[PDB]
Design a protein around this motif. Structure first.
Motif, mmCIF file in Angstrom:
data_model
loop_
_atom_site.group_PDB
_atom_site.id
_atom_site.type_symbol
_atom_site.label_atom_id
_atom_site.label_comp_id
_atom_site.label_asym_id
_atom_site.label_seq_id
_atom_site.Cartn_x
_atom_site.Cartn_y
_atom_site.Cartn_z
ATOM 1 N N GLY A 76 0.803 -1.253 0.000
ATOM 2 C CA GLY A 76 0.000 0.000 0.000
ATOM 3 C C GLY A 76 0.828 1.292 0.000
ATOM 4 O O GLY A 76 1.183 1.792 1.070
ATOM 5 N N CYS A 77 1.127 1.834 -1.184
ATOM 6 C CA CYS A 77 1.960 3.059 -1.325
ATOM 7 C C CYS A 77 1.130 4.351 -1.617
ATOM 8 O O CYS A 77 0.254 4.387 -2.489
ATOM 9 C CB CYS A 77 3.026 2.760 -2.396
ATOM 10 N N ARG B 146 7.867 2.564 -1.741
ATOM 11 C CA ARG B 146 8.309 1.182 -2.091
ATOM 12 C C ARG B 146 7.219 0.105 -1.763
ATOM 13 O O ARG B 146 6.767 -0.020 -0.620
ATOM 14 C CB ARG B 146 9.642 0.860 -1.357
ATOM 15 N N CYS B 147 6.803 -0.667 -2.776
ATOM 16 C CA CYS B 147 5.750 -1.707 -2.642
ATOM 17 C C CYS B 147 6.100 -2.975 -3.483
ATOM 18 O O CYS B 147 6.500 -2.922 -4.645
ATOM 19 C CB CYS B 147 4.398 -1.076 -3.055
#
Length: 12
Positions: free
Chosen positions: A1-2, A11-12
């Motif tokens: 979840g970004c 970052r994801c």
């Protein structure tokens, strides 16, 4: 979840 760069992650 970004989401919003100053509190939530990119970052994801």
């Amino acid at each position: 979840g970004c989401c919003s760069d100053a509190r939530c992650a990119w970052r994801c």
